[PDB]
Amino acid sequence: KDQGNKKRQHGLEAKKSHILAARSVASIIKTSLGPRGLDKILISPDGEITITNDGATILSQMELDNEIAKLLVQLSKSQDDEIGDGTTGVVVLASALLDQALELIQKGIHPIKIANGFDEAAKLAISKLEETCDDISASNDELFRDFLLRAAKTSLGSKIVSKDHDRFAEMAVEAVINVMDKDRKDVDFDLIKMQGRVGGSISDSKLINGVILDKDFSHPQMPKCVLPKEGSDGVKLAILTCPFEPPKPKTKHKLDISSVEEYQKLQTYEQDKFKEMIDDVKKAGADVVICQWGFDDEANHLLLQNDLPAVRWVGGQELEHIAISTNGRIVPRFQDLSKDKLGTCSRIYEQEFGTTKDRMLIIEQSKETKTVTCFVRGSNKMIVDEAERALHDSLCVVRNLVKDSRVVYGGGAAEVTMSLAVSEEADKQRGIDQYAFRGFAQALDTIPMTLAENSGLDPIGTLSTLKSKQLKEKISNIGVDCLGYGSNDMKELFVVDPFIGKKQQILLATQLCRMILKIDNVIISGKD
């Protein structure tokens, strides 16, 4: 059915257009791969203009009907969930494997022979890189946090973070230590809440041991701080979905009073319904009140005399973070209140930041929690949003480092060593893979050449330089000048990449290159 609007590609034209279309889509993120990579203007469907160099955001912003490029988007999708760092480079590395595969197809090599070649070349390059890795967390533990702090400074140097980055790198280190124990070594990014606000300066970004929102108390005269109240149990917080007041309709009111009878009754009832709902706080024994619905003027006055601060209209997701940190619950009504459903915490206060009118609030613990909230500040909107993702990428870096103590240097130093090992072993196999191994070594050389093109260096001259310095002396990692440091040899410059992160990058990129070669026919129909 619907023979029309159906295109098919098979045979000769299939192996050509698939590689050329993959190179055209990847060529956008090639120039954006690096610390010096060029940004991209991305226009949302609503017309909003965003500027970012992240390849994962580019492929997500790109809406296209090309199925070959959709496989590249699925590569960055699995790369972002597993790691979340090399999403830009994993597609460029896969494109280098596709370009070298096209040259082998023109030589008469079968596509499976190319796929089996990149598979054996990958397993060979993994073993050679696994022997050259070093351990950080070994010996002194303070030395680990020293390298862990300077490793976050490397990932944050490509962003506007780089100004104050000394303090921001400490935030990524202190965040992973709080949500992780040395024995468990499990880092859950859901346990670290990423939050930021405009105003002030970026260097004022801190880390809280508990949930921090931006809220103003329902009444201005309410006290800004909440004490433990002389030997009580923690600080009790109440999360309820119903306000404290006589109930009122949320759609239309229109209550017709036929006679003074109902007028005198509702005057006395609702006046007494004021104190009955305020006494419910003392019945539960709670200090800070947080509700989904607002309060009347009398409710704010009665809670003022009783020293009971109230916060109105808090989001549902924000109530979940409070219930997890303070071990509280969301109570539907006022009849279900108890002392076991109230949030237990050490101190609650409204902290003022300079002259800013935000005046946020902080719920503290004073012991190590199972969740934290990353607090970010900035002098401009786009600076805040960029700092949130920059720290989020740092959270992905610190996660792989604590998960696998084996680390390898990077910035082009690792890919060249992987290329030199495959080029030497290519002569011993003497098979069809001999052409696949040489193409695999040239495909690994694309990454340092791409970084050299973004840094203003000769990609051919630097590649021969990166190899020559790693031959006459030793295979030891020697990086690229992209960050504008004094010289090469990142080992002195402390540029570290996780071994588990580089292994998943060279794997999924090799697997995707094979899946494209496994497809010799494409049938595309219309859109119903």
Partner 1 sequence: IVVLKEGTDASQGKGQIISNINACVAVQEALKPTLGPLGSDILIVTSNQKTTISNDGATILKLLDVVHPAAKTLVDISRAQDAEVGDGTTSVTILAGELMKEAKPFLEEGISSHLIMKGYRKAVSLAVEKINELAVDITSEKSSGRELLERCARTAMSSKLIHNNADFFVKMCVDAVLSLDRNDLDDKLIGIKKIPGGAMEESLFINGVAFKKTFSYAGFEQQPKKFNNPKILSLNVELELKAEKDNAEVRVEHVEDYQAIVDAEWQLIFEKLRQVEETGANIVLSKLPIGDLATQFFADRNIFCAGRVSADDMNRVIQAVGGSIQSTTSDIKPEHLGTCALFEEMQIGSERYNLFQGCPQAKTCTLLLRGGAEQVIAEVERSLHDAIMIVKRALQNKLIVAGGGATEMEVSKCLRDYSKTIAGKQQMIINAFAKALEVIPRQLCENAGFDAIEILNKLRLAHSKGEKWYGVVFETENIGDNFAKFVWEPALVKINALNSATEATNLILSVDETITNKG
# binding residues, partner 1 (CB under 8 A) = 57
Choosing from 100, 218, 250, 499, the residue that interacts with partner 1 (CB under 8 A) is 250
Q: What minimum distance in Å lies between the beta carbon of 344 and partner 1?
A: 15
Q: What minimum distance in Å lies between the beta carbon of 437 and partner 1?
A: 17
Comparing C-alpha atoms, which of 184, 182, 80, 145 is closest to residue 392? Answer: 80
Q: What minimum distance in Å lies between the beta carbon of 69 and partner 1?
A: 12
Contact flag: residue 17 with partner 1 (CB under 8 A) = no
Separation between Cα atoms, residue 496 and residue 494, nearest integer Å: 6
CB 8 within 8 A of CB 522: yes
Choosing from 146, 270, 388, 404, the residue that interacts with partner 1 (CB under 8 A) is 270
Compose the 505-524 pattern: x for residues touching partner 1 by CB under 8 A, - for all others: --xx--x---x--xxxxxxx
Nearer to partner 1, 455 or 505 (CB): 505
In this structure, what token pair is assigned to residue 516? 């494209």
Contact flag: residue 225 with partner 1 (CB under 8 A) = no
Nearer to partner 1, 139 or 521 (CB): 521
- DSSP letter for each residue of 313-332: ---HHHHHHHHHHTT---BS
Separation between Cα atoms, residue 446 and residue 433, nearest integer Å: 19
Separation between Cα atoms, residue 435 and residue 110, nearest integer Å: 12
Contact flag: residue 49 with partner 1 (CB under 8 A) = no
Q: Given 52, 80, 85, 88, which residue is catalytic?
A: 88
Contact flag: residue 183 with partner 1 (CB under 8 A) = no
Contact flag: residue 47 with partner 1 (CB under 8 A) = no
Report how far Cα 123 is from the mean position of its chain's Cα atoms: 29
Contact flag: residue 105 with partner 1 (CB under 8 A) = no
Choosing from 81, 131, 142, 183, the residue that interacts with partner 1 (CB under 8 A) is 81
Is 302 in a helix, a strand, or coil?
helix
| Catalytic status, residue 54 | yes
Nearer to partner 1, 332 or 484 (CB): 332
| Catalytic status, residue 344 | no
Q: Given 52, 80, 85, 87, which residue is catalytic?
A: 87
In 309-401 the beta strands, taken as DSSP E runs, fall at 310-312, 343-345, 348-350, 361-363, 372-378
CA contacts within 13 A on the Cβ side of 204: 14
CB 243 within 8 A of CB 295: yes
In this structure, what token pair is assigned to residue 262? 């109902």
Contact flag: residue 333 with partner 1 (CB under 8 A) = yes
Contact flag: residue 194 with partner 1 (CB under 8 A) = no
Contact flag: residue 48 with partner 1 (CB under 8 A) = no
Backbone φ and ψ for 58, nearest 5 degrees, come out as -65, -55
Q: Taking each helix axis from N to C terminus, what angle separates 433-444 and 111-131, rounded to the nearest 10 degrees? A: 60
CB 223 within 8 A of CB 235: no
CB 221 within 8 A of CB 380: no
Handedness of CA 194, 482, 420, 509 (dihedral sign): positive
Contact flag: residue 332 with partner 1 (CB under 8 A) = yes
Nearer to partner 1, 2 or 48 (CB): 2
| Catalytic status, residue 287 | no
Which residues are 375's β-sheet partners? 195
Beta strands at 40-43 and 49-52: parallel, antiparallel or unpaired: antiparallel
Compose the 229-248 pattern: x for residues touching partner 1 by CB under 8 A, - for all others: ------------xx---xxx
Contact flag: residue 469 with partner 1 (CB under 8 A) = no
Cα angle for residues 198, 201, 202 (degrees, 5° grid): 85
Contact flag: residue 275 with partner 1 (CB under 8 A) = no
Contact flag: residue 459 with partner 1 (CB under 8 A) = no
Contact flag: residue 252 with partner 1 (CB under 8 A) = yes
Q: What minimum distance in Å lies between the beta carbon of 343 and partner 1?
A: 12
Nearer to partner 1, 107 or 333 (CB): 333
Contact flag: residue 324 with partner 1 (CB under 8 A) = yes
Cα dihedral 460, 68, 74, 30 in deg (nearest 10): 20
Known catalytic residues are 54, 87-88, 393
Contacts to partner 1 by CB under 8 A: 1-3, 8, 10-11, 67, 70, 74, 78, 81-82, 110-113, 119, 241-242, 246-252, 255-256, 266, 269-270, 273, 316, 320, 323-324, 329-330, 332-333, 335, 504, 507-508, 511, 515, 518-528
